Structure 1
Amino acid sequence: GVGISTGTFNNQTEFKFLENGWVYITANSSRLVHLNMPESENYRRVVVNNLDKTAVNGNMALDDTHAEIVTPWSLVDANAWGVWFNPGDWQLIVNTMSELHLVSFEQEIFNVVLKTVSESATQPPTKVYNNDLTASLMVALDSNNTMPFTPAAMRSETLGFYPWKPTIPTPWRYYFQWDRTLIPSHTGTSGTPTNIYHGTDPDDVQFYTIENSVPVHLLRTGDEFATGTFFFDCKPCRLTHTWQTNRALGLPPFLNSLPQSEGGTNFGYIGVQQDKRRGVTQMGNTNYITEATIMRPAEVGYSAPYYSFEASTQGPFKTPIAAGRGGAQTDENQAADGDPRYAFGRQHGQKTTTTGETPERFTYIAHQDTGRYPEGDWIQNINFNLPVTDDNVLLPTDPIGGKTGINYTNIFNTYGPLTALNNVPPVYPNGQIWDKEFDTDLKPRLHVNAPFVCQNNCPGQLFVKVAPNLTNQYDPDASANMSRIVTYSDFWWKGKLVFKAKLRASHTWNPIQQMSINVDNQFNYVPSNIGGMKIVYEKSQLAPRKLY
């Protein structure tokens, strides 16, 4: 009833250790959530079109042109690592465990509260807030996944990462179909490259409403809403990085001459003429067998176009990359590897005392050396007469199509039936946790936004909405105003995410990478002179593995 709570706050993280080193990680998460009534109780089809920026020529990539359905509903998305784990938790997870399974997920909404403002009482005149006891909060759970999947992690719009700080849902909205052409150009190109918004292919129109798809529950103060327990099935996510590239696969060449004093240039030498060697290569011409020449069983990682933009029906988009990291010491190629860059604000990691509209950012460079360093690429002519002529080799220096700043590697692609890959590492805290699988007849070997993909069915999305609180004058047949009492709601959200992981074991003489503090660093994990505070990105695959 009114004066009786309907739930319990629990943001406790339990680690239940079992037999055969399987651990049963139960992550609890609770938040106080704040919610206002919709801007309007209507669904809207809105179009965005920034010709003001695209007609600039050489500005094709800044396209934001799209169409959208704006719903009066808000989404409660807790699909992000930072919702479930604090740094201390992650440390434990990452340093001590070898793989990670996604087991189950459940959530409930409780201690619902509704208050009306209204206002103006009296002189100076200030504002005043009263309870509307009979008022309702609409909750709807799309458990059939009828509706478009919109993970909020991509826009850094999930729930807050701090337990003691309140949070909010985000207004729900989704993509509506649109045709669109945009011909690329450069600064020199004059005239106007055609840049048009064609409209909407009727054969592709899908207008969804919560109301026609999902049962909605009305919750008053004394009501509570709980979901079942959803059980996952996915591949395990591994918490070890592979360090081997092709150049370190298999049996090393026997060294006939080993060093005889310590030091930094006391090298060992193979001791056989490169053309008098025994072994196997895939080069039918020469008898050279060198480390770059010697056959390897397959190919680790792959080369992909960068920065390639491709275009279909609805405009241009970047071509995504799987691998990374590929560069040597402190030098990479963040675009050839496709290392992701996260931008977020206060609620999700940025220092909460920071004023200003500018977000905090970082670029996740994985530990797994499976990417490329295209600067080191080349292509020789069939004859392999070497030292190689300028006419017989194509370097990443030699311009392509008569452009100084383009070389062959920008359009290069070495994916093939010998390509080997890892899945993306978890990015704490802003990374996504699970992601729906494309309903295409043939599917992606992975996703770049999340390590766990539900291929049969994912948990449904959770939607909330303040119930229409009408005044005494309401004429629906009038075009004019919907006059509603200004109403808003506070409700508590609790979730339980269960993982099951496996403990790692030492197979080397040496110790290995692990997180810690650090006299540097040490200050990213405590509040400040005022109420703190900050959460910092922090890797995931610290321990080395072994490809081969």
Structure 2
Amino acid sequence: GVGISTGTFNNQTEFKFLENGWVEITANSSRLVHLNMPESENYKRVVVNNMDKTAVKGNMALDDIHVEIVTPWSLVDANAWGVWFNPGDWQLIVNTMSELHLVSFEQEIFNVVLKTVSESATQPPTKVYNNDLTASLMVALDSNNTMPFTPAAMRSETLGFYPWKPTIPTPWRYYFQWDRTLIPSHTGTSGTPTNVYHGTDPDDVQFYTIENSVPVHLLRTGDEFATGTFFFDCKPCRLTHTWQTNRALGLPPFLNSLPQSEGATNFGDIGVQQDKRRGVTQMGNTDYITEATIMRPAEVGYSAPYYSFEASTQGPFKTPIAAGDPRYAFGRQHGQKTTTTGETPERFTYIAHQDTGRYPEGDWIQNINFNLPVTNDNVLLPTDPIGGKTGINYTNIFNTYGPLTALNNVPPVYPNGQIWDKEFDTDLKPRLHINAPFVCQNNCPGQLFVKVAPNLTNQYDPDASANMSRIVTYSDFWWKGKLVFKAKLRASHTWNPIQQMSINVDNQFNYVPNNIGAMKIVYEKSQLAPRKLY
């Protein structure tokens, strides 16, 4: 079946309007993947140590020591908005829909090709490329999710973001258990602190192998491989933002005095002594009913320790937060001006709100007796130092998460954000994930692994440390996916128009190529349109 294609190229996205403001978005995405022979046909357990870095009292956060099992397989990840939608599409989705539902997903590998490089060592010397018509491309689709979940979006290693630009899969590797101790220290810290990699705990050792836990298919040119259709089990993602804070929840105080002429200084006036007002308060002490005192239903948002690093058996790690900022570093293949030189990533900090965010500088604590103006001794301000440290206040320690905490889930981040994420297999689970807006609880699509089957030479001896020598082979194959969403059309509820993504005299050139054909994909806001929270 050499002279016959086994698939079709399709990179169109279709919006099929169903019944009652609900539409069905079908994002088709296909690409040409380039894959090289494994640098090593073996599984390696590799340790990464960098104490020297962390050895510098004050450089703890720069800790990279970990252990990973390097597999001879590559992973074809497409989990990132940039892989399915282009700027124009994102505008549409983001501007006219009000919520998105992730529905199904399927992939296929067609028109497989395997070539061979001959080093025609003549003069220059030359180099030749030929077709190995009988060579095979190994494919494995871990449907039962046996293998560790390794989303490539976290290291900006997904498939390209341009339909017309060949891409490639990423070398697959996963974490291996290890013990490590690193004790905090600042510039002044005396003597060498404790910084040591202890090793591996036998009881947590898990050496995974694809061969052993997943059936492998060998695809020759004539062959093709197709995944079935997976249907997710995720909650709907919203494309609306709330803005209210406890200070804007409920019936505003009745103004007994209203302005009588336009004017920035023409304010209205409640017109009632702060301690002779009616209403509800949760302060059994005072008779003071103020906008900061009046009782609200619950609390929109919470406060958490900032730049807090906790430690467990593998080392320190930043205490994650649900507030509002992700920082995305990437490049060339996923945005970053294509013609850009050097090897410095491009990046952005997607800022998302005032929906649950906090201004620490505005926080403060007072003595139960109240008694204002409050005395310095009865107030702990975000200015008074903790532990004697000049740069540490109670807020860095503070946590106001509790039974009344209201909160929203992560918004979509085009085009660098991950789309769906697998849930933790713990008995109690995170009320949300910080990395993706969609989390398949029970079932998530299985990972797809590719690998160029070993093209041996006439000389091969299993019983020899040597290192099998094989014909230089590589494979190019097309990949095609289909991600289906279900979305609801938004409606206008206010008299005033609203936030909409548009092209300006300023963005204009972030959506077109240049005289050299350089390109780039700029990030974009996703939940632009207020929604009444209460």
Same fold (TM over 0.5): yes
Cα distance, 1:368 vs structure 2: 4.8
Query: Identical aligned pairs, as a percentage?
Result: 97
What's the secondary structure of 1:241's corresponding residue?
Answer: coil
SS at match of 1:511: coil
Return 5+ residue gaps in structure 2 as ranges: none
2:445 corresponds to: 459
Render the CA deviation track for 1:120-177: whole Å, top value 9, x for unaligned.
Answer: 2532222110000000000000000001000000000000000000000000000000
Contact 1:301 1:370 in 2 (8 A): yes
1:342 aligns with 2:328: yes
Distance 1:102 1:289 in 2: 46
Contact kept? 1:241, 1:368, Cα under 8 Å? no
Deviation at 1:52, TM superposition (A): 1.2
Paired residues of 1:75 and 1:171 also in contact (CA < 8 A): yes
Contact 2:324–2:353 (CA under 8 A) maintained in structure 1: no
Separation in 2, partners of 1:416, 1:337: 15
1-structure distance, mates of 2:251, 2:199: 60
1:10-34 deviation per Cα after TM superposition (whole angstroms, max 9, x unaligned): 0000000011111000000000000
Instruction: Give the drift of 1:118.
Output: 1.5
**Residue pair 1:114, 1:133 contacting (<8 A) in 2 also:** yes
The offset of 1:417, in angstroms, is 0.2
Question: Which runs of 5 or more residues in structure 1 are unaligned?
Answer: 322-335
Structure 1 residue 291, shift from structure 2 partner:
0.1
User: For 1:268-316, what per-residue CA distance to the aligned partner results, in whole angstroms no more than 9, with x for missing partners?
Assistant: 1100000000000000111000000000000000000101000001100
**Would you say the 8 A contact 1:367–1:542 is kept in 2?**
no
**Alpha-carbon distance in 2 for matches of 1:147, 1:425:** 28
Shift of the 495–451 alpha-carbon distance from structure 1 to 2, 3 Å rule, reads: same
Contact 2:324 2:351 in 1 (8 A): no
Q: Whole-Å Cα distance in 1 between the matches of residues 10 and 239 of structure 2?
A: 27
CA separation in 1, counterparts of 2:37 and 2:92?
A: 41
C-alpha distance in 2 between matches for 1:308 and 1:228: 44
Matches of 1:337 and 1:367 in 2, distance apart?
9
Aligned residue for 1:203, secondary structure, equals helix
Could you say what the CA RMSD is over the residues aligned between the two structures, in angstroms? 0.8
* Whole-Å separation in 2 of the counterparts to 1:260 and 1:369: 33
Aligned to 1:469: 455
Residue 337 of structure 1 deviates from its aligned partner by 3.7
Describe the shift of the 1:504–1:141 C-alpha distance in structure 2 as closer, same or farther (beyond 3 A): same
Q: Secondary structure of the residue that 2:222 maps to in structure 1?
A: coil
Q: Distance in 1 between matches of 2:38 and 2:221?
A: 20
- The answer on 1:507 being equivalent to 2:508 is no
Contact 1:320 1:338 in 2 (8 A): no
- The answer to whether the 8 Å contact 1:367/1:541 transfers is no
How far apart are residue 233 of structure 1 and its match? 1.4
Shift of 1:532: 1.8
Deviation at residue 369 of structure 1 after TM alignment: 2.1
TM-fit CA distance, 1:457: 1.1
Tell me which residue corresponds to 2:284. 284
Instruction: For residues 43-100 of structure 1, give each alpha carbon's deviation from its aligned partner in whole angstroms, at most 9, with x where no partner exists.
Output: 0000001011011111111000100000000000000000000000000000000111
Task: Tell whether the 8 Å contact from 1:10 to 1:29 is kept in structure 2 after alignment.
Answer: yes
The CA deviation string for residues 190-212 of structure 1, in whole angstroms up to 9 with x for no partner, is 21111111100100000000000
SS in 1 for 2:493: coil
Whether contact under 8 Å (1:121, 1:128) holds in the other structure is: no
How many residues align structurally? 534
Q: What is the CA deviation profile of residues 480-530 of structure 1, one whole-angstrom value per residue up to 9, with x for unaligned ones?
A: 121000000000000000000000111100000000011111110000111
* Contact kept in structure 2, 1:58 and 1:184, CA below 8 Å: yes
Alpha-carbon shift at residue 367 of structure 1 (Å): 3.2
Q: Which whole-Å deviations, capped at 9, do the CAs of 1:433-488 have from their partners, x for residues lacking one? A: 00000000000000000000000110000000000000000001010121000000
Q: Please report how far the alpha carbon of residue 338 of structure 1 lies from its aligned counterpart in structure 2 after TM superposition.
A: 5.5
- TM-score w.r.t. length of structure 1: 0.97
> Is this contact kept in 2: 1:114–1:489, CA < 8 A?
yes
CA distance in 1, matches of 2:327, 2:393: 25
